[PDB]
């Protein structure tokens, strides 16, 4: 699949809103992920004891993890599908070290869309939601290919 320039511009326009406060957005996204899919928290060896939203919010270390993830995602989205350099090390760490199934990337894609819908309806209307779905789907498909190259199904 490919995104049009129109679609990339919708994706990057709403992404600029995230950058007003990446840490706050990442906190919402991670908490959404963990509460919607408690099994995902088990993958974070440093944080798997933080089993409620109140505990999650009170860890600056967890919020720094959120910043790291969203900063990397922002850089990937700005490659507009020419993102192969950014994905090889990311796939290697998530396939082989963190052991993240592709389905968990579908979960965090869901959480990202949910948080953007909650916080930025003025720039996350119907067209922008479709474009972001496609951009994150492309990210997951390209990661899944790199998983396969490393011998992991995902
Ligand atoms: C948009 C999707 C994601 C992006 C861009 C992303 C990015 C990153 C980056 C850049 C790092 C630090 C370098 C590395 O270890 O590769 C990291 C660490 C990590 N990621 Fe991801 N990630 C994503 C999704 C996920 C998901 C869904 C999970 C688990 C359900 C996960 C689990 C982890 C863990 C456990 C670490 C190590 C955290 C720590 O330092 O304690 N990642 N991620």
Residue numbers in the entry: 0 to 153
Could you share sentences copied from the article?
For this study, a sperm whale myoglobin variant Mb(H64V,V68A) with high activity and stereoselectivity for olefin cyclopropanation reactions via non-native carbene transferase activity59−63 was used as the model enzyme. The high stereoselectivity of this carbene transferase is dependent upon the configuration of the two mutated residues in the distal heme pocket, which enable the precise control of styrene attack to the heme–carbene reactive intermediate during catalysis. Using a myoglobin-based cyclopropanase as a model enzyme, our studies show that covalent stapling with p-chloroacetamido-phenylalanine (pCaaF) provides higher stapling efficiency and enhanced stability (thermodynamic and kinetic) compared to the other stapled variants and the parent protein. Crystallographic analyses of singly and doubly stapled variants provide key insights into the structural basis for stabilization, which includes both direct interactions of the staples with protein residues and indirect interactions through adjacent residues involved in heme binding.
To gain molecular insights into the effects of the engineered thioether staples on the structure and stability of the myoglobin protein architecture, we sought to determine crystallographic structures of the stapled variants, focusing on sMb5(pCaaF) and the doubly stapled sMb13(pCaaF) variant. For comparison between staples, the structure of sMb5(O2beY) was also pursued. Structures of sMb5(O2beY), sMb5(pCaaF), sMb13(pCaaF) (P212121 form), and sMb13(pCaaF) (P21 form) were determined to resolutions of 1.7, 1.17, 1.3, and 1.3 Å, respectively. Importantly, well-resolved electron density can be observed for the eUAAs and cross-linked cysteine residues, further demonstrating the formation of the thioether covalent bonds. Consistent with previous results, the parent protein Mb(H64V,V68A) showed a melting temperature of 63.0 °C, while sMb2(O2beY) and sMb5(O2beY) were previously determined to have a higher Tm′ by 10.2 and 13.0 °C, respectively (entries 1, 2, and 6). In this assay, Mb(H64V,V68A) exhibits a T50 of about 61.1 °C (entry 1), whereas sMb2(O2beY) and sMb5(O2beY) exhibit 2.7 and 10.4 °C higher T50 values, respectively (entries 2 and 6). For example, the amide bond in the pCaaF-Cys cross-link should result in considerable reduction in the conformational flexibility compared to that in O2beY, which has instead an ether moiety (leading to an additional rotatable bond). Thus, stabilization is expected to follow the order sMb5(pCaaF) > sMb5(O2beY) > sMb5(pAaF), which agrees well with the experimentally observed values.
